[PDB]
Structure 1
């Protein structure tokens, strides 16, 4: 679709071509982050700090459960009730309906309250009544079992209490850091698996492993941050927040590719100029449009986004990319650093009056006219060239 010859004459060079992927059809698994740990090994010396920690956990989980109930009541009443909400965007109403649909798994999790409380190690997998599986997180119990139980004989009782109080304070701080935006807005906020794992020593590989997935396998999903987490249920007395973590599938957009453009400085009457274009241009069947690659993720061979994220292009840029190059944006190179050459289709295009161009077959400098912008380098005249510092071999123009 792009007019590559005119763009090369203006100094715009075809780059890599990527596939394009969108989140779709997510699969979900359950996870319970227990805020009040099981401390049966050190229960005697932690009496004062544990009650304070329980009160602090209750004071931060009560508004969360109140906000969850204020959302469930709206749906349970009727179908979201457009009167009870008053105002919201489409995403909020969709999230509320999804939360009501997930209330069944919330009740299934709440059925396992005693088994959740009786977990006595860092990560445990429990068989749910619906034949599902959920992961229990007991980060403090890992700290206890690793740092206090092996040395329980040496430490005095007051020292144990102080150390466990510091550990509980640290875990509360980490929860407030990661789950902070979620506890203030439970129905809308989604937390990535890395941010969720930040309360578990940033060990997201262990979280993925216990839920059935090897971290090296899902890297196209994990890298783009598509493994989200959403609050499903909060119990203020048992002290846990349970999450439903998505593992979305990626669908190939039909007949859509993402094209990379590499800019090259070109000379006009001795002066260096760079043409200003988006570095990524999305090509559909009959349309050409921008793509905000910052909010997406660029992999080795594909571009992954959670939504379509396609944006229209100005008529000037459309004309620039379709062959009317007089309308392209361009700026003077007062800097000393710009790419003076690039390699595409086995041919190196270089700006030979602003950088040196030499042949190795005969050590003579090739001349490019002041009446042309970028010179084509290929096997028709010379076989291996030196541009700037580097010297590379080159294919043929006939290809």
Structure 2
């Protein structure tokens, strides 16, 4: 439970409040990415280039089929994993293996549609499966032929058509190696985001989502957070395609979990300028404080959205600091020319008026701050419009038992923190 009045006196001002969300239950859609295109219309001119290409595709997929079959043979049917056959695995790996087995029904439904997939002549098509599920099938290369070669085909000789298609087949191959590289090497454990899958399809993830029945504008939270992901459930070596299953997860709101932002400003210590060291975000669960590493999460207007729960333990001293004992708040000296010197909270302005400019516009007078005063509070008790630095701002009233003051503030120890500095410091401590 954060204590805001004692924190503001060491320059820590209450910022925005966000709620906390984590990935919830799954929902899936099926997709096929074709590696071997339908080249009807250019077959006689491109015969040489196309046969070379097909052989390369086969060599890429054969090792993938072996990896997928190796895992399927370790699961029998809930489903039981053969621990001895698998030998070594993480809990996540074992779970992925079981999931692959469960998805085999969809893989078979897709395989039985092989002819419909092969005979598709449009870059994007939707097929129906025997189990009433839909399948999104894409062949980027066919699109490029339909748009760039066919409309002008009567102007091109076969040598030109052959060379032109060969370059297209080749650049597509490079896009596959880049987007699915890791997934082809480890098809059981690797997941691919929708924005990465779309890099094979000219980067058009909006089209892929539309086929699967979604509007991009309605998926902002899971799309932007990178939570729409797929995995390889099957491959067909001779047909030349990869079967993916794509997840569109729900989000779970975590009860009694609040993420609070803190806004540090500089403060005065007998003529010197200092800043207090606290984490930007603090996670509170009912009553307890913990650390939240938001560099691994997406922060939105109202929510912090994480894939999993990333709460980390907070040190004893930091909890003591945040709960109101300022003698435990480590501070660092400011040496650079800029640092935030004011902030707005609940309509009031907190500022270091010894390092920035504070004036009352109603009276055209300067605002003083004694050297023993750490921060100054600007409210509407005496003046409505203040000049703070290069801006003018109107403020509200102060709520409290009496006039705000920061005349006798207990400060924590000074620190210098860096990788090299800690090395030198800790060595000095143990050497002495």
Instruction: Measure the CA separation in 2 of the matches of 1:230 and 1:125.
Output: 19
Give the Å deviation of 1:189.
Answer: 0.4
Instruction: Measure the CA separation in 2 of the matches of 1:339 and 1:15.
Output: 14
Give the Å deviation of 1:19.
Answer: 1.0
- Give per-residue Cα distances to partners, 1:179-222, cap 9 Å, x unaligned: 00100000100000000101101100000001000000010110
Instruction: Measure the CA separation in 1 of the matches of 2:262 and 2:227.
Output: 27
- Give per-residue Cα distances to partners, 1:33-79, cap 9 Å, x unaligned: 011011011111111111111111011100011000000000038xx
Instruction: Measure the CA separation in 2 of the matches of 1:364 and 1:370.
Output: 19
Q: TM-score, normalised by structure 2?
A: 0.91
Give the Å deviation of 1:329.
Answer: 2.1
Deviates more, 1:322-331 or 1:227-236: 322-331
- Give per-residue Cα distances to partners, 1:130-178, cap 9 Å, x unaligned: 0000100110011111110111111111111101000000000000010
Instruction: Measure the CA separation in 1 of the matches of 2:386 and 2:272.
Output: 24
Instruction: Measure the CA separation in 1 of the matches of 2:304 and 2:18.
Output: 6
Give the Å deviation of 1:313.
Answer: 0.8
Give the Å deviation of 1:322.
Answer: 1.0
Instruction: Measure the CA separation in 2 of the matches of 1:369 and 1:329.
Output: 23
Instruction: Measure the CA separation in 2 of the matches of 1:347 and 1:286.
Output: 27
- Superposition RMSD in Å: 0.8
Give the Å deviation of 1:314.
Answer: 1.1
Which consecutive residues of structure 2, in runs of 5 or more, have no partner in the other structure? 400-432
Which residue pairs with 1:116 in the alignment? Answer: 117
Which residue pairs with 2:194 in the alignment? Answer: 193
What does 1:86-125 correspond to in 2, within 5 Å?
86-125=87-126
Instruction: Measure the CA separation in 2 of the matches of 1:189 and 1:325.
Output: 47
Q: TM-score, normalised by structure 1?
A: 0.98
- Give per-residue Cα distances to partners, 1:229-256, cap 9 Å, x unaligned: 1111001000000110000000110111
Deviates more, 1:116-125 or 1:324-333: 324-333
Give the Å deviation of 1:323.
Answer: 1.2
Instruction: Measure the CA separation in 2 of the matches of 1:275 and 1:152.
Output: 70
Instruction: Measure the CA separation in 2 of the matches of 1:276 and 1:49.
Output: 63
Instruction: Measure the CA separation in 2 of the matches of 1:332 and 1:103.
Output: 61
Give the Å deviation of 1:326.
Answer: 1.3
Which consecutive residues of structure 1, in runs of 5 or more, have no partner in the other structure? none
Instruction: Measure the CA separation in 2 of the matches of 1:101 and 1:170.
Output: 35
Give the Å deviation of 1:287.
Answer: 1.5
Instruction: Measure the CA separation in 1 of the matches of 2:370 and 2:382.
Output: 16
Instruction: Measure the CA separation in 1 of the matches of 2:217 and 2:104.
Output: 32
Which residue pairs with 1:146 in the alignment? Answer: 147
- Give per-residue Cα distances to partners, 1:253-280, cap 9 Å, x unaligned: 0111100001100110111111111111
Instruction: Measure the CA separation in 1 of the matches of 2:292 and 2:112.
Output: 46
| Partner-residue secondary structure (3-state), 1:152 | helix
Structure 1 residue runs of 4 or more that deviate by more than 4 Å after TM superposition: none
Instruction: Measure the CA separation in 2 of the matches of 1:27 and 1:113.
Output: 24
Give the Å deviation of 1:286.
Answer: 2.7
Give the Å deviation of 1:82.
Answer: 0.2
Give the Å deviation of 1:324.
Answer: 1.5
Instruction: Measure the CA separation in 2 of the matches of 1:168 and 1:178.
Output: 16
**Number of residue pairs the alignment of both structures matches:** 396
| Partner-residue secondary structure (3-state), 2:199 | helix
Instruction: Measure the CA separation in 2 of the matches of 1:328 and 1:134.
Output: 58
| Partner-residue secondary structure (3-state), 1:216 | helix
Deviates more, 1:107-116 or 1:317-326: 317-326
Give the Å deviation of 1:381.
Answer: 1.1
Instruction: Measure the CA separation in 2 of the matches of 1:26 and 1:336.
Output: 50
